[PDB]
Amino acid sequence: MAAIPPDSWQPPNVYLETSMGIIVLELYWKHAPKTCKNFAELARRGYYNGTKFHRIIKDFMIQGGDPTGTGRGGASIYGKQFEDELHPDLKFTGAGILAMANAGPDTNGSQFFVTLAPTQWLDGKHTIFGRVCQGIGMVNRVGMVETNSQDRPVDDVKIIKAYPSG
16 A cells, blocks of 8 residues: 655765774764764864864763864754753763763753763763774773873874765
8 A cells, every 4th residue: 555666775874084093983864963964074074084083082982073072162053952851771891982962951062072981970971972882992992092080082093984885
């Protein structure tokens, strides 16, 4: 009853070609279409290309830059700030996840942090957006490496290019 000859697959995987190492991510095109489009657009337009990770907490997580890495010049495709895409369903405990960073009520930025270690205390503080199925290993080393006495990476980690799977 009513058959649609044509079909649509759409690659739900993203390939971030970082200087540190290549890692695949999983975007939620169901509840995350909003942030998903932003993350994909920013990477497609050529914003993430050239940036790097400034925040790296040993045995915890590592947040990547975007808004000039200093809140100097950063804006979302939809606008400056939007409504948080938080929805009771995901969790930030399983080592290797991609949660969208925020600032305040109805105030979201363009940062992204991947949790490499179990965290229940912060399980709810930030919002989700993607996952790291194939790549957590590359991130693990980034946390095991030598860091500063605050949150500065002693090693060299940056992004050279990024493209979605085809």
